[PDB]
Amino acid sequence: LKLLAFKARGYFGDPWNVFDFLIVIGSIIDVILSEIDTFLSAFFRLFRVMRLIKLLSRAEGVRTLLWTFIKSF
């Protein structure tokens, strides 16, 4: 939906959308893996957990504080 609503030009424009893309792709590969395993990598099951970082996309005090310090370091 997001892609259809940003011709892909404005979707990949927001630094958070890129993170979203990353998560999605990895999560899918994880499933396909768990699949080609039983049809015939404990690094891909970590893409499920990373979704939580999105929450940091709404929190504006946390995000702000975070940036503030991550900008001094």
Ligand X SMILES: CCCCCCCCCCCCCCCCCC(=O)OC[C@H](COP(=O)(O)OCCN)OC(=O)CCCCCCCCCCCCCCCCC
Q: Which residues bind another protein (CB under 8 A)?
A: 9, 12-15, 18, 21-22, 25-26, 29, 33, 36-37, 40-41, 43, 67, 70-71
- List the single partner that 53 binds among ligand X, another protein, none, CB under 5 to 8 Å by kind: ligand X
User: Hey, CA dihedral for 46, 49, 54, 60, is it positive or negative?
Assistant: negative
User: With binding defined as CB under 6 A, does residue 21 bind ligand X?
Assistant: no
By the 8 A CB rule, do 11 and 3 touch? yes
Whole-angstrom distance, CA of residue 44 vs CA of residue 67? 28
Smallest distance, Å, CB 20 to ligand X?
10
